[PDB]
């Protein structure tokens, strides 16, 4: 199980 989503918002 994993709670942090892998962020991909480079902006």
């Amino acid at each position, epitope marked *: *199980i*994993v*709670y942090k*989503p*892998v962020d*991909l*918002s*480079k*902006v």
Partner: antibody
Amino acid sequence: QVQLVESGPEMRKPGESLKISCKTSGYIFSDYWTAWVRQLPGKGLQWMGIIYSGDSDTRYHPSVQGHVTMSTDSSLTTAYLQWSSLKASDTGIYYCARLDARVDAGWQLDSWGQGTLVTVSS
Amino acid sequence: IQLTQSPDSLAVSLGERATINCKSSQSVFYRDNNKNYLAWYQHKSGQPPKLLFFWASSRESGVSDRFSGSGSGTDFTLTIDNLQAEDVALYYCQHYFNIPHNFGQGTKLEIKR
């Protein structure tokens, strides 16, 4: 006109090199990623990976990682998908699509390429 | 994280409610954002995949009023009311919680006339 346009169908032999293109026009290229999606025969979609132009940040599916390579040329507004040495098993339809890179926005594929049937055979 | 859709195939009559469900092996609902990292797709013959929904329930621009995105946590649902003939397609749920952004196996929707 949000439009991704891939190259036409390609034919190769096993062992040979190939790079297909994904020409992105009608929007700001730095605002998005460009994903790659293999169409499985009959039914299915394997998400291969993604690539961002300004940073050159690659994230792959652990099965396809190492076997294929991604790259982007920011001047042409194009994304690519290379094969160093093709197998017969690589044959299939390969889609590309944009993923939204803005702050607190969803990473979903809203606009897609037409698709390219890469075929590897002796 | 893997996705198992249910059913694989489905025949539904013109004007009936079509129900396609999607099940996560883990969980694509981040508690801080109050948002489900999950989308839905339609895939007709001779065309690329068209996006239906994202954030589970939020609808794409131009997508029909008859289509509905719903469910939370592990279990999600696509609901096509008043089924029209053009809705003949393969349907795919997809998560983007973590990498890889896996699609589901595929749900084939056939029309009964």
